Design an enzyme around this catalytic site. Structure first.
Site: not given
Ligand SMILES: Cc1cc2nc3c(=O)[nH]c(=O)nc-3n(C[C@H](O)[C@H](O)[C@H](O)COP(=O)(O)O)c2cc1C
Ligand SMILES: CCC1C(=O)NC(=O)NC1=O
Ligand SMILES: Cc1cc2nc3c(=O)[nH]c(=O)nc-3n(C[C@H](O)[C@H](O)[C@H](O)COP(=O)(O)O)c2cc1C
Ligand SMILES: CCC1C(=O)NC(=O)NC1=O
Lengths: 304, 307
Positions: B44, B131
């Site tokens: 995370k 972020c």
């Molecule tokens: C619940 C949740 C929490 C996430 N937390 C982070 C995070 O802490 N840092 C980050 O770079 N991306 C975070 N993301 C974004 C994912 O890493 C990813 O870039 C985004 O969900 C697109 O991928 P997907 O279509 O497979 O969901 C988060 C996404 C979700 C749904």
């Molecule tokens: C800053 C963490 C953040 C992220 O990078 N991407 C996302 O979807 N949700 C989040 O909270």
């Protein structure tokens, strides 16, 4: 005792539905089918001063969840103006004209020629800033140029924004131009890329396959933009565009602040009969909820 | 046939990993990712101190994906550094650590402490510049951050990028990234920011923070994700691209690799299915390659046919 009527820009629209600019509105035949449809209104293809052949084909492509396109193609401003001049049955429904000139001076010279027709027939301008709208000093400049060359009110078609700093900056500029009476959110999400698994190749030819997305892909982004500008531009109308397939989708656009609801990808796929279904499904939703008019819930999305 | 990836001085059994923030906040989740068949995993995104995040509900499942506004709930840097230094089984698979400090100095201080652990254990840094609940949407800030980390951190590192939507921004970000030799990989993409979802029945937004606006993941983002992967694959040939966004099948992963991805991250789909998804994704990707005669990913990575 319910109604879908929308009383805006000094017109009574029978319902909030119309085609999105660019979809079923480039030829006399398509415009005719739209005027015959049950839609509350219709808008023309975004026209340029001279006719344009269009980008190389294929320029559109149906996706499982929507569409991608790089259309780039119009009969020229002269065609659509004359359609507004002497060919559109305004007794059926009001007409919007979309223009997308490549310059401030280009658009302005086009608005000067439309000011007579707007005055005598009532056609309404939608200025396609979508990118001029991703550069705010250029945006401020077009809007000042148009406001000075065009006596009549008009609207703007906006690209999607993805952060509040851009929402704030776009709204602060638009709120300085009182002739901008409506904002249409949104144009396509730009420069997506679709690849076919079997052929291992992109599905549209121009620009190495990069094109604008529509359909179910863009719906949450469209609602966000509709509601963001509804909140920040309470003195203007918002027209929702993006991801509408059902009357429930339209209900959500209105809940987010939409006055009119434009239909692009789904109309391309289903034809003008879609509006008979959309009006019915929307009235269904309001009937289930006891709503009698759109004014009762437009912009009334609740927080938790 | 083989799904192996040889990059960054490591051998990965296959290109799949979790997306940062999904199934990676606690020791139990990291251990579950390590025990899975994924080729790698990432922590995370952490801040210098623990954070509880935004108030719930802050995640909601959509027909075609997800919306979230978590606001970086995380156990704090010291926790993930300890996991990297003392708990992770590097004989199972390599590890990435994601950091997301609120300023350039916060990030540099974290990197200073990570440096010796990275040297001894091999954990690999991914800096989150995207972020959404954004640094990379402000290019001179982006350049400030990258110079700060490069000054503070002796090893190569990667960057997690938000989506861009026009070639002028692709070119602008690429031009900055190619000026920093320590940036060895670029992850495309984070969520599409500030979408909005409304429930028909309640007529209300579905997540509480920020008036219901949150980042979109899942199938909504797949064409944007492929576009960003390919745009940076083309403009940054000296860097690796990691693809993230919309992966639910082996065919989706195949297209990311075709677009240029070296590794393929899985977020929303992994949130819904759990870590057995990686057994399904490898089997599906192998089936796609078998039908076409490919025996290694390098036979088609980046070979999308375009223009
Ligand atoms: C619940 C949740 C929490 C996430 N937390 C982070 C995070 O802490 N840092 C980050 O770079 N991306 C975070 N993301 C974004 C994912 O890493 C990813 O870039 C985004 O969900 C697109 O991928 P997907 O279509 O497979 O969901 C988060 C996404 C979700 C749904
Ligand atoms: C800053 C963490 C953040 C992220 O990078 N991407 C996302 O979807 N949700 C989040 O909270
Ligand atoms: C084939 C096609 C042509 C389009 N042409 C225009 C256009 O000329 N001017 C414009 O402002 N928008 C144009 N658009 C964008 C649509 O007006 C609409 O904003 C977009 O498709 C999103 O709506 P949807 O999800 O219902 O498709 C076009 C869209 C498509 C699919
Ligand atoms: C310039 C018109 C253009 C647009 O604005 N949106 C779209 O989807 N396709 C197009 O060709």
């Amino acid at each position: 005792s319910m109604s879908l009527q929308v009383g805006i820009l000094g017109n009574t629209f029978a319902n909030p539905f119309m085609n999105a600019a660019g979809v079923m509105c480039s030829t006399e035949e398509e415009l005719a089918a739209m005027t015959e449809s049950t839609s509350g209104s219709l808008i023309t293809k975004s026209c340029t001063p001279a006719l344009r052949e269009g980008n190389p084909a294929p320029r559109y492509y149906t996706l499982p969840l929507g569409s991608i396109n790089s259309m780039g193609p119009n009969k020229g401003f002269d065609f659509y103006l004359a359609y507004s001049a002497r060919h559109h049955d305004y007794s059926r429904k009001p007409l919007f004209i979309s223009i997308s000139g490549f310059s401030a001076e280009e658009n302005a010279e086009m608005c000067k020629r439309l000011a007579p027709v707007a005055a005598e027939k009532g056609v309404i301008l939608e200025l396609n800033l979508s990118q001029v709208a991703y550069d705010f000093d250029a945006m401020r400049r077009y809007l000042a140029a148009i406001s000075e060359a065009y006596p009549h009110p008009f609207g703007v078609k906006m690209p999607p924004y993805f952060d509040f700093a851009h929402f704030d900056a776009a709204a602060e500029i638009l709120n300085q131009f009182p002739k901008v009476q409506f904002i249409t959110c949104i144009n396509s999400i730009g420069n997506g890329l679709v690849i076919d698994v079997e052929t291992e190749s992109v599905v549209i030819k121009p620009k190495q396959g990069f094109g604008g997305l529509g359909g179910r892909y863009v719906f949450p982004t469209a609602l966000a933009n509709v509601n963001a500008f509804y909140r920040r531009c309470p003195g203007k109308l918002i027209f929702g565009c993006g991801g509408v397939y059902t009357g429930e989708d339209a209900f959500l656009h209105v809940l987010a602040g939409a006055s009119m609801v434009q239909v692009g990808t789904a109309l391309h796929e289903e034809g003008a009969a879609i509006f008979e279904r959309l009006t019915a499904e929307l009235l269904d939703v309001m009937a289930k909820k006891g709503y009698k008019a759109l004014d009762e819930f437009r912009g009334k999305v609740k927080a938790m």
